[PDB]
Amino acid sequence: TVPVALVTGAAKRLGRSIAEGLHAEGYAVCLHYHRSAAEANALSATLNARRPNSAITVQADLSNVATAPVSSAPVTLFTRCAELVAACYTHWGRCDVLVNNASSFYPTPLLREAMETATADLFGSNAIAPYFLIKAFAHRVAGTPAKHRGTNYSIINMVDAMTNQPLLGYTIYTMAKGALEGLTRSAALELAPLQIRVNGVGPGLSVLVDDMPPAVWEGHRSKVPLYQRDSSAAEVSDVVIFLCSSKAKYITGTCVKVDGGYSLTRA
Amino acid sequence: VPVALVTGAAKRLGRSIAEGLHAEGYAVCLHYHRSAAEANALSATLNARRPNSAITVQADLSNVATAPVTLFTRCAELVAACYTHWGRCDVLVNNASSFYPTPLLRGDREAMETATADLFGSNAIAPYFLIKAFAHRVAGTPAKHRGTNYSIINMVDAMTNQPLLGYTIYTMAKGALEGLTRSAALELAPLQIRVNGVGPGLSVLVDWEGHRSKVPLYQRDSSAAEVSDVVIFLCSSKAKYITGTCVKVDGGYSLTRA
Amino acid sequence: VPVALVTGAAKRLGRSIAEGLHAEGYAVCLHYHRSAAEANALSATLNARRPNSAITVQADLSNVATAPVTLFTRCAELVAACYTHWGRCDVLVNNASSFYPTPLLRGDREAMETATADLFGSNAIAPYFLIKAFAHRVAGTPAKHRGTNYSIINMVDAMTNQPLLGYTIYTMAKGALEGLTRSAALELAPLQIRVNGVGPGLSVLVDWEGHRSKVPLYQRDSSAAEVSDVVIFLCSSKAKYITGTCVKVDGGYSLTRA
Amino acid sequence: TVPVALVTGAAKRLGRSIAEGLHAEGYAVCLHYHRSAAEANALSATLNARRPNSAITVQADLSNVATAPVSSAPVTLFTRCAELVAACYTHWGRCDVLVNNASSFYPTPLLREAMETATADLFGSNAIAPYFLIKAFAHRVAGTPAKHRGTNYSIINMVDAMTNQPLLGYTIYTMAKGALEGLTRSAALELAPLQIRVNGVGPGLSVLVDDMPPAVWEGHRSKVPLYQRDSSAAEVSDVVIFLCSSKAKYITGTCVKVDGGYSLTRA
C-alpha cells in the first residue's frame, strides 16, 4: 500500500527535506506552500519524474485570517486547513502522516495594523493552523471504517529546542511554539485511542546560510557544542522520518531536540 | 502607595489575589468582564477599609474587536486606567481566563472561532498586550521617578503537562502563557520588571471526591489563599531576585500518574 | 518553639538561612564540618539574641565510614540531636554541599573515590538519610503531639540543566537531589511533611565580571538573603499547599544561551 | 569497517534486544552480564553462529563496591568499568558505542547492612558505573590518534520516562536515574569536542510479563494511553539503534521517552 503524507511549508529548506525523505521511503506527498509556488511545483515535478503520481501541490495562507473565496463568504483558516487534508483524500483516498512545518518567524519587540497581522500570522502558522489541521486529520480517520484505516498514522509538529532560552524580541513566535508543544501533548493523549501518534521535533540552529550574513552566520554557528555549526536540513528531516516509521510506534507525546547540544549552553 | 492591576478580579482566585495585595497596602484595579455586581461590591468593601484604594474597569479579553476597538487598545486602556487614576502601575496579575472544552473529535464554525478567540485571547493574547502596555508605561517614565518593585505574575496551570482530555485550546493557551513569562522576563529585565508564573493544581472546586482524593498532600483542592499568598510573596521585595520562573501550588498532584 | 536543622550552616547561604529561620522564631541546629569557629560564633550570636535558641553539631556528610560509624548513623544522630535537645525537629534544610571539578578528560584512583563519596554524599546520599531519619521521628510521634508545619528544603541548582564544564559528579548529585525532592514529597505527603527545592543561579561569588554580567536581572549575582528569604517563605504556613517543587532564584540566568 | 558496541546488562529483556539490534546493523558486540552468565553465553553463541567473531561476553558487578581480585588488593568499581571498555579494544581494537542499560530496581521505603548494599547497588548500577564507563570510553578515544578514531561514537543511557511521577517506595532508584539524566547532559557537553554524542532513552512500562503476576500486569498496562499495554523490547531497542545511527548525528544531550504517552497521565 502507498501511504500519503501532507507536509506544510514544503517548498524549501527543512520542509522540502522532510518531503523528500518521506518520498524516499515510499510515501506519496502533498506539498503545501504559501508564497513559494514555483519552488513547490518544481519539487513536485522532480518527485513525479522519479515515481509517477507521487506528488501534488496545494496553496494556503495559514495565518489566522479570513481570505476571499476561490469561486460566497470569506473563508476561515479552519476551512482552508480542512481543505488541505481533503486534498489528500480526494487524490489518493487517505492521509497517513501530517507534518506541521510551516512557520512565520520575525520580531515582535515588547520595547498599528501591523501588530494585528503579526499576531494572526505568527500564531496562525505556528499554532492555530496546526490545531485545525490535526482536527481535520483526526476527523477523516474517525470517519473511515476501521477495516479501511491505515496502520501507522503519525503527526509531527516542528517545535524549537531553544524557545526555553528565548531569542530576545520574538515574544509572539516564542509563545506560539510553546502552544504547539501544548498541542503535541494534548493531541497525543486525545488521539491515542485512534492510534494516531503526535510528536515534536525541535531544531536548534539549522541551515543558517540563507537567513544570515556571513559574519553573523559564523558567530552564531560557533556556539553549538557539537561540531560548532548549524545543522543541515537532512540532520533534522531524518529524525522526522524515523518518528513516522513503524519502528517508532510506541513513541507519542514527546518532543525530540535536534540541536547539537545548543540548549545545554549558558551565557 | 503602589498600584496593582488584577484581571478577572471579581471572584474566586482573582478576588483572593486582590484582597491579599490590598492587605499589603496596594491600591488595586479590579478588572471584570461579566461580574459587575461582584466587582463593584469588592471595590466598595476595599474602599470601606481604606478610602480610594480600589476601582473597577470592565473589558472582554477575548481576541475580538468590539464596538472598531481592538483587543490591544482595550488592554492599553486597562493599563492607562491605573495611571490616569493613581499615576502608577507597579504590579500586573494576568488571572482572567476562560476554560471549557474544545474536543478534537465529535454556525458551528463560528462558535469554534469564538472559542479560539476567547480561550486564546484571555489566557495568552491579552496578557501579551497588557504586558506590552505595562512595559511601555515604565519605559516612558523618567528613570528618576520609576517604582522600585515592578512585578508581573501570570496565572498558569501546574497540570497542563498532563493534559485534561478535551481541553486542547485551553492547554495550548497556557503553554503560550509560559512562553510569554520566559520571553518577557528576559526582555524586561533591563527595566527591572520581574515576570513570573503561579500554577495552581486543583483549587476552590466548589465556588468532586474523585479529583480531590488524588491530591497527595491533604487529599483536597487548595483554598483561594493557599494560591494568592504565593502570588503576594512573588510580588514582595523579598522575591526580588526571582524572574522568568513558574511556581506550582498543587499539593503534589503533578507528581502523580494514572 | 519550632526547631530547624540547617546543614552547612556555618557561613554563606547556610548562615543566611539559619539567621532567617532564627528571626521567624525557630530554635536552630547549626551543622558544620570544618567550620567550627564560624559555627560556634554564629551560635553565640543567636543565643545572645534569644537564650537557648541555637546549638552546633559537627559531621562529615561524605559517603564514608568514620572512627566504624556509617553515614546513615551520623545522619540519624544529627536528627536525634534536635530531639534530644529540644524534643522536636520541624524543618530540615539540606544545604551542605561540596563543589569542585571531576573532569572526564585529562593514589589517583583513591582520590577519585574520595571525590565521588564527598560530592555524592553531601549533595545526595546524606540528604536522603537525613530525610529518612526526620520522617522516622515524625512517624514515631503520636499524632496528637506532631507539629503542624513540617517542611524539608533541598538546596538545588537552577543551572545544572546547562552544565558547567568539568563538574559531572556534582551535576549528577544535584539531579539525584531533584529526584529525592519529588520522591520524598510524594511518600511523605500522608504525614503532611512538605519537601521542596530552592535553586540559586549565581550567589555571593566573593564570600567575576564575566559571570555576573550575563545575569539578565541586575547583571550581578544574588545576595545571601535574596536566596534565604525564599527558603523561609517555603517554610512558612502560607506555602502550605506547595510540595514536590523546585523554585529557581537565578535572576533569569537559566533563560540564557551561549 | 566493523564498529563495536559495549552493552551493559545485555543477557536478556531490553539489553538483549539492544545487542541484537546493534548486531543486525553490523556491529560486533561485547555483552556484559552480572548474574546471567548462561543466558549471556547462549546469546553470544547465537550471534557468532550468524557472523563469526562478532560477539564476546564479559562479567562484572557494577554495584559501587570493591570486589576480590581474579588472580593483589580489592578491585574498585572504577577498575572493573575500565576493564569492560578495555575488553573491546583488546579483542577488536575499538569501542564505538556504549549503551548503559544495566540497572538494579527494588524498593527503598522512607517509612542495617542491607541499606548500605542497596545504596551501593542501586546508585552504582544506575549512575556511578555509567559515569566510570563513560570516563573510560572517552579516555580510550582521546588516546587514539585522530587519524584512527572512528566516525560515529555514541553513548546511550537508559533512563526512565516516569521518574518525574515517582513510583512510591523507590527513592534511591529514582534519585539514581535523575543522576543519570545529569550525566547525559554533562557528558554530552564535555565530550562534544571529541564528537562523542551522549543521549538517553526512557521507557515507560516495558515487557512487564516477567516481573508482575497476571492481575497486576493487566492493571498496570491498562493505564498506557497508546495501545493500553506495555511496550515490547524491540519498541525500545529500535529507538536506541536509531540514535546510534549516522542519521542521528546532530542529536546530543537529549533524553527520548518511549512510553506510549504514560507520562502525560495524571491520577
Ligand SMILES: NC(=O)C1=CN([C@@H]2O[C@H](COP(=O)(O)OP(=O)(O)OC[C@H]3O[C@@H](n4cnc5c(N)ncnc54)[C@H](OP(=O)(O)O)[C@@H]3O)[C@@H](O)[C@H]2O)C=CC1
Ligand atoms: N531554521 C532553524 O534554525 C529553526 C527551525 N525551526 C522550525 O523548523 C521548521 C522549519 O524551519 P525552516 O525551514 O527554517 O522554516 P522557514 O522559516 O523556512 O519557513 C518554512 C515555510 O513556512 C511557510 N509559511 C510561513 N508563513 C506562512 C503562512 N502564514 N502561511 C502558510 N505558510 C507559511 C513558508 O511557505 P512559502 O515559502 O511557501 O510561503 C516557508 O517556506 C519551522 O517550524 C521552524 O520554526 C526551529 C528552530 C530553528
Ligand SMILES: NC(=O)C1=CN([C@@H]2O[C@H](COP(=O)(O)OP(=O)(O)OC[C@H]3O[C@@H](n4cnc5c(N)ncnc54)[C@H](OP(=O)(O)O)[C@@H]3O)[C@@H](O)[C@H]2O)C=CC1
Ligand atoms: N481553579 C483551578 O483549579 C485552577 C485555576 N488556574 C488558573 O488560575 C487563574 C484563576 O483561576 P479561577 O479563579 O478558577 O478562574 P475562573 O474560571 O473563575 O475565571 C476567572 C475570571 O476570568 C474572567 N474571564 C473569563 N473570560 C474572560 C474574557 N473573555 N474576558 C475577560 N475576562 C474573562 C472572568 O470574569 P467575569 O467573571 O467578571 O466575567 C472570571 O471570573 C486562571 O488563569 C486559571 O486558569 C490553574 C489551574 C487550576
Ligand SMILES: NC(=O)C1=CN([C@@H]2O[C@H](COP(=O)(O)OP(=O)(O)OC[C@H]3O[C@@H](n4cnc5c(N)ncnc54)[C@H](OP(=O)(O)O)[C@@H]3O)[C@@H](O)[C@H]2O)C=CC1
Ligand atoms: N553559591 C552559589 O552560587 C550556588 C549555590 N547553590 C547551592 O546552595 C547551597 C549553598 O551554597 P554555598 O553557600 O555556596 O555552599 P558552600 O560551597 O559554601 O558550602 C556550604 C557548606 O557545606 C559544607 N560541606 C561541604 N562538604 C561537606 C561534607 N563532606 N560534609 C559536611 N559538610 C560539608 C561546608 O561546611 P564547613 O564549611 O563547615 O566545612 C560549607 O560551608 C549548596 O547546596 C549549593 O550547591 C546552587 C547554585 C549556586
Ligand SMILES: NC(=O)C1=CN([C@@H]2O[C@H](COP(=O)(O)OP(=O)(O)OC[C@H]3O[C@@H](n4cnc5c(N)ncnc54)[C@H](OP(=O)(O)O)[C@@H]3O)[C@@H](O)[C@H]2O)C=CC1
Ligand atoms: N522494564 C521497564 O518497564 C523499564 C525499564 N527502564 C530501564 O531500561 C533498562 C532496561 O530495563 P530492563 O530490561 O527492565 O532491566 P532489568 O531490570 O531486566 O535489568 C537489566 C540487567 O541489569 C543488570 N544488573 C542489575 N544489577 C546489576 C549490578 N549490580 N551489576 C551489574 N549488572 C547489574 C542485570 O544483569 P544480570 O541479569 O546479568 O545480573 C540485568 O539483566 C534499565 O536501565 C531500566 O531501568 C526504565 C523504565 C521502565
Ligand SMILES: CN(Cc1cnc2nc(N)nc(N)c2n1)c1ccc(C(=O)N[C@@H](CCC(=O)O)C(=O)O)cc1
Ligand atoms: C536561529 N535562526 C535561524 C532561523 C531561520 N528561519 C526560521 N524560520 C522559522 N519559521 N523558525 C525559526 N526558528 C527560524 N530560525 C535565527 C536566529 C536569530 C536571527 C536573528 O537574530 N535575526 C533577526 C535579528 C535579531 C533581533 O531581532 O534582535 C533579523 O531579522 O535579522 C535570525 C535567524
Ligand SMILES: CN(Cc1cnc2nc(N)nc(N)c2n1)c1ccc(C(=O)N[C@@H](CCC(=O)O)C(=O)O)cc1
Ligand atoms: C481543575 N479544575 C477546576 C477549574 C475550575 N475553573 C477553572 N477556570 C480557569 N480559567 N482555568 C482552570 N484551570 C480552571 N480549573 C478541573 C479539573 C478537572 C475537571 C474535569 O475533569 N473536567 C472535564 C472533563 C472534560 C470532557 O470530557 O469534556 C470537564 O468537562 O470539565 C474539571 C475542572
Ligand SMILES: CN(Cc1cnc2nc(N)nc(N)c2n1)c1ccc(C(=O)N[C@@H](CCC(=O)O)C(=O)O)cc1
Ligand atoms: C556559581 N558558582 C559559584 C559557587 C560557589 N560555591 C558553590 N558551592 C556549592 N556547594 N555549590 C555551588 N553550586 C557553588 N557555586 C560558580 C560558577 C561558575 C564557575 C566557574 O565557571 N568555574 C569553573 C571552571 C571549571 C574548570 O574548567 O575546571 C571552576 O574551575 O570552578 C565557578 C563557580
Ligand SMILES: CN(Cc1cnc2nc(N)nc(N)c2n1)c1ccc(C(=O)N[C@@H](CCC(=O)O)C(=O)O)cc1
Ligand atoms: C514498571 N515496572 C517494570 C520494571 C521491571 N524491571 C525494571 N528493571 C529496571 N532496572 N528498571 C525498571 N524501571 C524496571 N521496571 C514495575 C513497576 C512497579 C512494580 C511494582 O510495583 N513492584 C513492587 C511493589 C510495589 C511497591 O514497592 O509498592 C514489587 O517488587 O512487587 C514492578 C515493576
